[PDB]
Write a protein that binds this ligand. Structure first.
Ligand SMILES: Nc1ncnc2c1ncn2[C@@H]1O[C@H](COP(=O)(O)OP(=O)(O)OP(=O)(O)O)[C@@H](O)[C@H]1O
Ligand SMILES: [Mg+2]
Ligand SMILES: [Mg+2]
Ligand SMILES: [Mg+2]
Ligand SMILES: [Zn+2]
Ligand SMILES: [Zn+2]
Ligand SMILES: [Zn+2]
Lengths: 85, 105, 642, 171, 280, 97, 112, 161
DNA sequence: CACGTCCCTCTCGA
RNA sequence: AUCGAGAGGG
């Protein structure tokens, strides 16, 4: 309904360790459910290491919808979020 | 404002003028200004255009703001009213200056 | 299991709290509770169409329920009811009933005060529901008369100073009147649609007239079960028959010859059962007992054990526990798990091209072989026990099946001492399956859990999905937690053996010869394989304690500490200075290598990384301990002698 | 009647379909379980209009289950019959107690007693018919009936019609 | 109780520390939006010490033959000697240093100069001297333009709350204010070239790493700071009164004013067991 | 083994949000109740292998939702109901901030 | 002014033995009681009386009593406190739950 | 999973799901959409054929085989309700070509009648104003009989062969 | 006048 | 088996 536009953002531009952790996890759970791998599986088996390689190449097709207390939010795409860690 | 020496008749008689805030303070607590004490920080009144600003800039609901008692020894000193906000500047050991805000419940 | 239901799946976002109406209880009730008989048509396993399964839940595992045909595991249960012959105060709303009767004209049904009073229009301004209803009752119990105007409004009956004897109310006039359940109910029902709403109530979800029970809801078996060994119902299934016994007395006692004294007794009796049934730890009262006390529904929920120990805390599958022993040849972020635990603890891996080749080998290894598996879960989902299934051999795995397989080397597990007073007291380690029945953890991770290896016991939890997995390894990993927010310092560090021998080692008198030096150098797995030019060469190639230690400290580290009188030409090997990961001077002690505010651990974890420092922990426990092995160290009564 | 309601459906997708041919399989699955459907609340869903413009938004990755969920806002042609609306329909079934009319995707039923008195049942006919003065409702004639009552049974809502009134009968 | 009154308390995406109602407990966790792990007890040399030594250690007088950066420490010490358009900034710099010194002495009335703050600067400069191998003899290839302006720009990029309107921006200045004091303290134009001997590369390296090591120290929106402070306060109390017999009869202030008073403090309670007025 | 109160607090500080749900659901009670879209209780007779859903008394057959909650919750709710307390579980919402 | 005294009286019993906990924690609790208007004690009446969700406050003392006056005042639980989700078996808006995760058809075909 | 939207005799007392004031899919507001047996066939045909156009990037009593093929190309087989509807619609559509149907809509929609009447008027072929108002009792007291009979006349005329 | 830390392991008696 | 009672361990 309401929502925020991507030119009025204000949240920390880096990836929250909880976001990184739930994205590496989320993709791992999805990758382990035989979901398409968008990265170049270079001799990989573990579905987490694939997701870590997917998050290292930022080829993860996920958007983090960061909910602010007022109810409204502002999505950030995994590929646009910096990954300082 | 009136300064009752030792007592005041409850002849209640105060809240009685619509376009007037009828304030009352005693001479005993006014002997030493409390706002001069080590632990009492700067309390600043907020204009109705400042409150309506801080509430939208922090995306707040009025209830969600930290509250300052109506009869707070400082809320009276500044003659606060219901709904007035007061930015509070305290010297913190992590940022040096930390802005807090309280609404007068 | 639980079959698939077309119904959409949602999460709960609002929980509406309110009160039943006697009419809504009659509505939902899948069966009227008519008999107090347990479940004895002929005491057969067939239950009685009166109590227990007149349509509610099922009593027998081999029996589908009479409402939702799913039977047992799936049947939520289905509430019944029993129409009360006489209204009854709710044990919990007892005081809240009085607080209202004090506020409203016990004859007029309108409020004792209204908006014409300065304090009532003030108290009424309070939209805080419960602070208003308190600010109303405060200034309402006093004015005890149905006024007629005083500038009209409204008949005038004086109001009684009400008090409670326990389960019944009385009010004085000037008259000792025991206020009736229906009479109060009749007053509450007549309360202005808007009057009770402004009194901290609600027009649809919490009408006052429902603090008085005209129709009781009967919970289904799953709430008050019954188990066999022959059978025996639940302490609340009993309490119900007790309530129904107390009701059927009133049902007939009042139908025919009305003796009023008896009527006014079996009613108070019934009020008792309905009261203790909900709360049996009442104020006055004897507190009932059946062949004893009895279990009040309120007692099921009382804090600590009872949905605070059923919902705030549960017992869980995929868990373990054993004695813990310390290992100096393990890595910091590891936990030596006994083989047996790794054969009982599983992980539902999903079949995929990435793992299918490993997975099928495990299956063939089975539940007895260490690197084996226990269950295989198909497309259809029914479980396939690899210990007893005939096809436990010629079984062909499909993509997308789940292979509940044994927990193997380097899975993430939640590890914890029990006084869980710490974010650190629950950490995630890599599994490392090992023999003997002890959990084994690296000696440096003792201080976080505050564990010693003296009959100490530690829990182990195991994730079940690849995301809770990553959640443990990306947040709760032991090396991720090396520096605590608690005191903004390292919460792990060198302790015991390693510490004692690391100042013994880092000395000038302490020299290491070649046959001993090459052993030390090898133990460092991340070793550059290059022999450090010996601090002393020619008389006899010797190495300094700190010098040899430095190959384990990672090049790129700079640390600086000055103790008492520590100079730039250290007098008593004072203080500490490490430059580019090699020791310059100074003895290594708790200050240097402990969990110090600016210790080596702290510096290495910040300017190098969490997992880098972790490997440091091991790289030192593997070397320092090795040196102490061949130097040795003891303690006797000689050391307590001056 | 025959309306166009702005509907929305919550479809859930397994992660294996989290590829490029996803929006396709979302629409494919949207119509799979909506196209030839019926409800009663909204009525006979008949055909989702405007295939091209069909929002899907961003799908929520379910908490402890990888699958994503989308609210597929769409628009479709529906059909909810109403008690009191006249509808012309083709006669299909024809019994001794009445005859069924095929109006749209549903079948309105007419009772012998809802037909005017003079319409007598004609068992003697390969296509059983209701002979009368002028009309002869055969197995496959066109009739204009007035819906009298509506019943919603699962994925189908039937009805009961009358032709006893005026301006009602054959075409 | 602690864990139960602080459950829902977690840093939120605007760096507010709120509960489950949205009620604001703090506007930046720890009044500086920082994470507790990236924080270290380093010293702000701008405060304690002699007014005389302060000049010695920070003041740079370009219009002077005695108090000017000797051309051996800068690249242009002799060509900047007397330069006055530049000494305006060495004043601006030295002026904000004293505005600093006199501010700290307002916050830390007792004159204690060692406090915890993110980014170990005492470390970073060292980890830069070893990195670029600093020549304690050869002069520095830095301009006064370089130092005082790099610092001024470094501060603008030390973000805590990211925002646009004055309300939030003015609480940016606040949140950082203290950290910047250590920054200006340790990046004094005299220090950089006299005792640090920074080259240009070494300097710019120190600036960029400071920027990140700070931007890392910002607490993460999600952190359950409340259920954490609760444990952080409750663990040592429950754990201190478990190691009381390691010394047998010692008592001390274990169960004397610790466990007791703390129970008072949490319950508040007017019937305090020792009401004392320490009147100065 | 009991994953008790204190252990919950620890994972909370960790922020292990979905590992905590895994702790208290997949590895414990966790039940599939059929709540009603208007009353908000288990009363939704679930004849799912015939696919009939009803909260008669609310006379509802479409507004049904299956929801994942601990059986301990399901009990706690029934128990509250047995004391004439309605804990109507709602999938939608009406506040905001 | 009191908030500072509260902290100072909290820190003064911490700095004795085990003489360090970081300001933030103490200040948060301290601020917790403070930011209400007066002292809000850490006790089953002090804080537990707030306008929090019903189930939340029932997870700490006065357990059945709280759920009573909740359904009697027709209370509503936000479902925003951790305890609520814990009781309900849902991922709590806590760190790894403070955000939601979505796939945009855009990205999925940007790497098709 | 089941369908939802935003928000009883046949005298305009429809459900709430078919109440005049109903919300859009953007969130605005727009009048109810009632189509006459004819306006419904085009709407379907158009939508069904414009689905085949995007499935390429991956007469009187003889048109009925032309629709069956479209239904056996785009829609899934099991969808049987759509087949009967198109059959039905194809026979009982008073108006065949878009041009005529528009005029019908142009005529009816400018009378103020609530869409159900707009719909029912274009689908039921009446002569008398007495017949029209007795089959669509939602009127009766609204449009005058003469004016209604005037409008009824333009209908029978526009009845495309 | 209601709380009274956390888990874990066994024994026995209606 | 469930309730109660008790003794230990960390
Ligand atoms: N009553 C208790 N409640 C909670 N935790 C306890 C309790 N008793 C012991 N513990 C926990 O178990 C450990 C108790 O110490 P332990 O019995 O192992 O003795 P110790 O310190 O090794 O004694 P010693 O001085 O003889 O070596 C601590 O980690 C403490 O947290
Ligand atoms: Mg021990
Ligand atoms: Mg010990
Ligand atoms: Mg002990
Ligand atoms: Zn059932
Ligand atoms: Zn009156
Ligand atoms: Zn219902």
């Amino acid at each position: 309904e309401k929502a925020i536009p991507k030119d009025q953002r204000a949240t920390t531009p880096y990836m929250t360790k909880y976001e990184r952790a739930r994205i590496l996890g989320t993709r791992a759970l999805q990758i382990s459910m035989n979901a398409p791998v968008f990265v170049d599986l270079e001799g990989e088996t573990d579905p987490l290491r694939i997701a870590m390689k997917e998050l290292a190449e930022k080829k993860i097709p996920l958007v983090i919808r960061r909910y602010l207390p007022d109810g409204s939010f502002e999505d950030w795409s995994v590929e646009e979020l910096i990954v300082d860690l | 404002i009136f300064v009752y020496q030792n007592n005041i008749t409850p002849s209640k008689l105060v809240p009685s003028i619509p376009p007037a805030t009828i304030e009352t303070f005693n001479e005993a607590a006014l002997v030493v200004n409390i706002t001069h004490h080590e632990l009492v920080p700067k309390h600043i009144r907020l204009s109705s255009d400042e409150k309506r600003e801080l509430l939208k800039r922090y995306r707040l609901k009025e209830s969600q703001l930290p509250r300052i008692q109506r009869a707070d020894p400082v809320a009276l000193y500044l003659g606060l009213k219901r709904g007035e906000v007061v930015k509070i500047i305290r010297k913190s050991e992590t940022s040096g200056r930390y802005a807090s805000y309280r609404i007068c419940m | 299991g639980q079959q698939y239901s077309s119904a959409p799946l949602r999460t709960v976002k609002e929980v509406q709290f309110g009160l039943f109406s006697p009419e809504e209880v009659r509505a939902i009730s899948v069966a009227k509770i008519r008999f107090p008989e347990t479940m004895d048509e002929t005491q057969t396993r067939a239950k009685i169409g009166g109590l227990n399964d007149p349509r509610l839940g099922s009593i027998d595992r081999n029996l589908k329920c009479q409402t939702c045909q799913e039977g047992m595991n799936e049947c939520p249960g289905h509430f019944g009811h029993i129409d009360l012959a006489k209204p009854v105060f709710h044990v919990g709303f007892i005081a809240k009933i009085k607080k209202v009767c004090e506020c409203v004209c016990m004859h007029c049904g309108k409020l004792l005060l209204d908006e014409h009073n300065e304090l009532m229009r003030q108290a009424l301004a309070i939209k805080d529901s419960k602070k208003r209803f308190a600010a109303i009752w405060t200034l309402c119990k006093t004015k005890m008369v149905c006024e007629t105007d005083v500038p009209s409004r409204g008949c005038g009956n004086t109001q009684p100073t009400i008090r409670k004897d326990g389960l019944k109310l009385v009010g004085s006039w000037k008259e000792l009147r025991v206020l009736s359940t229906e009479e109060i109910l009749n007053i509450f029902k007549h309360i202005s649609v808007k009057d009770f709403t402004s009194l901290g109530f609600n027009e649809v979800f919490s009408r006052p007239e429902w603090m008085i029970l005209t129709c009781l809801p009967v919970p289904p078996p799953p709430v008050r079960p019954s188990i066999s060994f022959q059978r025996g119902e639940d302490d609340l299934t009993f309490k119900l028959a007790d309530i129904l016994k107390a009701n059927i007395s009133l049902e007939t006692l009042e139908h025919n010859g009305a003796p009023h004294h008896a009527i006014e007794e079996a009613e108070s009796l019934l009020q008792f059962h309905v009261a203790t049934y909900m709360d049996n730890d009442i104020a006055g009262q004897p507190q009932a007992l059946q062949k004893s006390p009895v279990k009040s529904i309120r007692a099921r929920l009382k804090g600590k054990e009872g949905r605070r120990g059923n919902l705030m805390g549960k017992r869980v599958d995929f868990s373990a526990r054993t004695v813990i022993s310390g290992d100096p040849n393990l890595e910091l972020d590891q936990v030596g798990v006994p083989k047996s635990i790794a054969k009982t603890l599983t992980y539902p891996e999903v079949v995929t091209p990435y793992n299918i080749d490993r997975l099928t080998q495990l299956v063939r290894n089975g539940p007895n072989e260490h690197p084996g598996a226990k269950y295989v879960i198909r497309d259809s989902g029914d479980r396939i026990d690899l210990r007893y299934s005939k096809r436990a051999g010629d079984i062909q795995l499909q993509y997308g099946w789940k292979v509940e397989r044994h927990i193997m080397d380097n899975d993430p597990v939640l590890f914890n001492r029990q006084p869980s007073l710490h974010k650190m007291s629950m950490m995630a380690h890599r599994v490392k399956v090992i023999p003997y029945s002890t959990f084994r953890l690296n000696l440096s991770v003792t201080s976080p859990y505050n564990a010693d290896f003296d009959g100490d016991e530690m829990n182990l939890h195991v994730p079940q999905s690849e995301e809770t997995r990553a959640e443990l390894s990306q947040l709760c990993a032991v090396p991720l937690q090396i520096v605590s927010p608690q005191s903004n310092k390292p919460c792990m560090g060198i302790v015991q053996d390693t510490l004692c021998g690391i100042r013994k080692l880092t000395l000038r008198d302490t020299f290491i010869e070649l046959d001993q030096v090459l052993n030390m150098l090898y133990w460092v797995p991340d070793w550059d394989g290059v022999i450090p030019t010996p601090a002393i060469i020619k008389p006899k190639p010797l190495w300094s304690g700190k010098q040899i230690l430095s190959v384990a400290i990672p090049n790129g580290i700079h640390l600086q500490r000055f103790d008492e009188g520590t100079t730039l030409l250290s007098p008593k090997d004072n203080g500490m200075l490490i430059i580019d990961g090699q020791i310059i001077f100074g003895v290594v002690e708790k200050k240097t290598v402990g969990s110090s505010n600016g210790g080596l651990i702290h510096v290495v974890t910040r300017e190098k990384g969490p997992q880098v420092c972790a490997k440091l922990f091991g790289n030192i426990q593997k070397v320092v301990n090795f040196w102490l092995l061949h130097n040795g160290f003891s303690t006797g009564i000689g050391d307590t002698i001056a | 009647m025959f309306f166009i309601k702005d509907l929305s459906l919550n479809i859930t997708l397994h992660p294996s379909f989290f590829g490029p041919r996803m929006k396709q399989y979302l629409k494919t699955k949207l119509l799979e379980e909506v196209e030839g459907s019926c409800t009663g609340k909204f009525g006979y869903i008949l055909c989702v209009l405007d295939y091209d413009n069909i929002d899907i938004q961003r799908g929520r990755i379910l908490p402890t289950d990888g699958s994503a969920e989308f609210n597929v806002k769409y628009r479709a042609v529906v059909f909810k019959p109403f008690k009191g609306e006249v509808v012309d329909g083709t006669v299909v079934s024809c019994s001794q107690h009445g005859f069924e009319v095929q109006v749209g995707p549903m079948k309105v039923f007419v009772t012998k007693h809802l037909m005017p008195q003079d319409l007598t049942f004609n068992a003697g006919s390969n296509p059983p018919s209701y002979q009368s003065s002028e009309d002869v409702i055969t197995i496959k004639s066109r009739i204009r009936v007035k819906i009298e009552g509506c019943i919603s049974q699962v994925s189908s809502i039937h009805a009961i019609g009358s032709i006893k009134e005026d301006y009602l009968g054959a075409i | 109780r602690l864990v139960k009154a602080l459950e829902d308390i977690m840093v939120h995406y605007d760096n507010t520390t709120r509960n489950s109602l949205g009620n604001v407990i703090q506007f930046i966790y720890g009044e500086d939006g920082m994470d507790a792990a990236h924080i270290e007890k380093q010293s702000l040399d701008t405060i304690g010490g002699s007014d005389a030594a302060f000049e010695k250690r920070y003041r740079v007088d370009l219009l002077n033959t005695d108090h000017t950066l000797d051309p051996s420490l800068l690249e242009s010490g002799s060509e900047i000697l007397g330069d006055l358009k530049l000494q305006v900034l060495l004043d601006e710099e030295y002026k904000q240093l004293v505005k600093d010194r006199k501010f700290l002495r307002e916050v830390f009335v007792d004159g204690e100069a060692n406090w915890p703050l993110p980014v170990n600067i005492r470390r970073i400069i060292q980890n830069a001297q070893q990195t670029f191998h600093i020549d304690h003899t050869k002069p520095s290839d830095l301009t006064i333009k370089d130092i005082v302006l790099g610092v001024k720009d470094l501060q603008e990029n030390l973000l805590v709350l990211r925002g646009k309107n004055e309300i939030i921006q003015n609480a940016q200045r606040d949140a950082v204010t203290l950290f910047c004091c250590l920054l200006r303290s340790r990046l004094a134009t005299r220090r950089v070239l006299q005792e640090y001997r920074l080259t240009k590369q070494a300097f710019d390296w120190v600036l960029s790493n400071i920027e990140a090591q700070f931007l890392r120290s910002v607490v993460h929106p999600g952190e359950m700071v409340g259920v954490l402070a609760a444990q952080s306060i409750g663990e040592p109390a429950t754990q201190m009164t478990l190691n009381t017999f390691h010394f047998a009869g010692v008592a001390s202030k274990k169960v004397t004013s610790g466990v007791p008073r703390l129970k008072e403090i949490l319950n508040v309670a007017k019937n305090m067991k020792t009401p004392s007025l320490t009147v100065y | 083994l009991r994953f008790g109160e204190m252990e919950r607090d620890c994972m909370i500080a960790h922020g292990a949000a979905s590992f905590l749900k895994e702790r208290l659901m997949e590895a414990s009670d966790a039940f599939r109740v059929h709540i009603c879209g208007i009353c908000g209780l288990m009363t939704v007779i679930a004849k799912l292998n015939h696919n009939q859903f009803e909260c008669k008394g609310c006379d509802n057959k479409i507004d049904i939702y299956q929801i994942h909650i601990p059986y301990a919750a399901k009990l706690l709710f029934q128990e509250l109901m047995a004391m004439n307390i309605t804990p109507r579980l709602y999938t939608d919402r009406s506040r905001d901030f | 002014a009191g908030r500072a005294a509260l902290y100072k009286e909290v820190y003064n019993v911490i700095a004795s033995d085990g003489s360090y906990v970081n300001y933030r924690h103490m200040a948060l609790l301290v601020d917790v009681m403070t930011t209400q208007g007066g002292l809000t004690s850490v006790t089953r009446h002090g804080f537990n009386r707030s306008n929090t969700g019903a189930l939340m406050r029932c997870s700490f003392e006065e357990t059945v009593e709280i759920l009573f006056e909740a359904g009697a005042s027709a209370e509503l639980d936000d479902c925003r406190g951790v305890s609520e989700n814990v009781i309900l078996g849902q991922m709590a808006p806590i760190g790894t739950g403070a955000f939601d995760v979505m796939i945009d058809e855009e990205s999925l075909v940007k790497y098709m | 999973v089941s369908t939802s939207t935003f928000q009883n005799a046949a005298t305009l007392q429809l459900g709430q799901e078919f109440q005049l004031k109903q919300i859009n899919h953007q969130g605005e507001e727009e009048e109810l959409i009632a189509l006459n047996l004819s306006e419904a066939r085009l709407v379907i045909k158009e939508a069904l054929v414009e689905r085949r156009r995007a499935f390429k990037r991956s007469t009187r009593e003889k048109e009925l085989e032309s629709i069956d093929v479209l239904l056996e190309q785009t829609t899934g087989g099991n969808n049987k309700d759509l087949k009967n509807t198109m059959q039905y619609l194809t026979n009982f559509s008073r108006f065949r070509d878009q041009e005529t149907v528009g005029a019908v809509i142009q005529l009816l929609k400018s009378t103020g009648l609530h869409p159900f009447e707009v719909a029912q008027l274009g689908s039921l072929a009446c002569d008398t104003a007495d017949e029209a108002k007795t089959l669509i009792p939602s009127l009766n007291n609204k449009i005058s009989d003469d004016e209604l009979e005037r409008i009824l006349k333009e209908l029978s005329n526009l009845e495309t062969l």
